[PDB]
């Protein structure tokens, strides 16, 4: 239809009708489902003319067309988004957010989300130019269901990208300004709004314990636990990610998670047909079992030890490695009674059966778990029994075969274990 | 204690 030269000539004219004609042509050219000529429009020096058109309040059509074109230019490579940013598009879009026309302000939300989604640098740029205030003003209405069809989803996504990325992490004041709205949205009844809100809280929980403490003090943990049980995987995945990132912090934050009732959902999460759900749940549990002894006892009371043993037995090697870590932390900081309950639930057989793995990490982890269980047995004066069990499970053969392992740590472990219990 | 589908980074 239109060539880059024709679009340049139309946009370089002074006739607003022709300028809008060429801007619409550029939108369609860059909206092509295949090979959009983004680099050719960039090389033609058109981004600045687009950022200028964004300010033509007199012609809202060309405002919309230029916003669309710039958004689809910033939707590609990081260098094309850099081009859009250098043209001064961030302040123009932030000002357009307040446009009386809802579609133009929605396109502006979209553009700012694409820009801030490139990385932490452009995110902090969008934040510095003052985007959070108007974006959240668009949601000030007490009832979120009064907002137009689709506006809330776009604004939630853009706010998620404004909480995304690390090195540097989002400015603290920005997170504290956005978190209450994220709570309100976490209590919304739209599946996609919930999904993006959980992803945003996940980004915010992935970091130091201070950020986790911010998120927890806002009081999202109960609603996150509620969403853990949602029927929508797009909602459970981010919710489980956030819950797992929270328990990686202090034992008080882990206890907040436990008190919210999260451990009651893990019997299903650890048996979810999706393997990623199983792996994330097992990793979260491994972080939980690495806590205080009372937290291990709460894991026991919720009946999760059977499920952790079951995932150590029947899951894939990824979830099985997470489960090995979980059981090793269970035995490392647990009580002799809890370790005895673990052995009663049948951990010896899976721990043995996983000693024939190529990953040296899981080998060392399981060896340490065995040493801890043996220390517990020694406290209980029943190490001969446990050695007989490992024998019956063919363990002794496994630990002896590990004597010929290249890694000095696995060899030395197996050697100490054999010399101390199997000699 | 150790640490470790996502929404799109850019759209349309």
Numbering used by the authors:
A (entry chain A): 75 to 497
B (entry chain C): 119 to 122, 131 to 138
Article excerpt on this structure:
In the best characterized pathway, importin (IMP) α bridges cargoes bearing basic, classical nuclear localization signals (cNLSs) to IMPβ1, which mediates transport through the nuclear pore complex. We addressed this possibility by x‐ray crystallography, and solved the structures of putative bipartite cNLS peptides of MWPyV, STLPyV, WUPyV, KIPyV, and MCPyV LTAs bound to IMPα2ΔIBB.
We therefore reasoned that nuclear import of several HPyV LTAs, including those from STLPyV and KIPyV, could be mediated by bipartite cNLSs. As expected, the major site P3 and P5 pockets are occupied by either K or R residues, establishing hydrogen bonds with IMPα2ΔIBB residues, except in the case of KIPyV LTA NLS where P5 was not modeled. As expected, neither STLPyV LTA cNLS nor KIPyV LTA cNLS targeted GFP to the nucleus, in stark contrast to both STLPyV LTA NLSbip and KIPyV LTA NLSbip, which conferred strong nuclear localization. Furthermore, all tested HPyV LTA cNLSs exhibited IMPα isoform specificity, with those from WUPyV and JCPyV binding preferentially to IMPα1ΔIBB, and that from KIPyV binding preferentially to IMPα7ΔIBB.
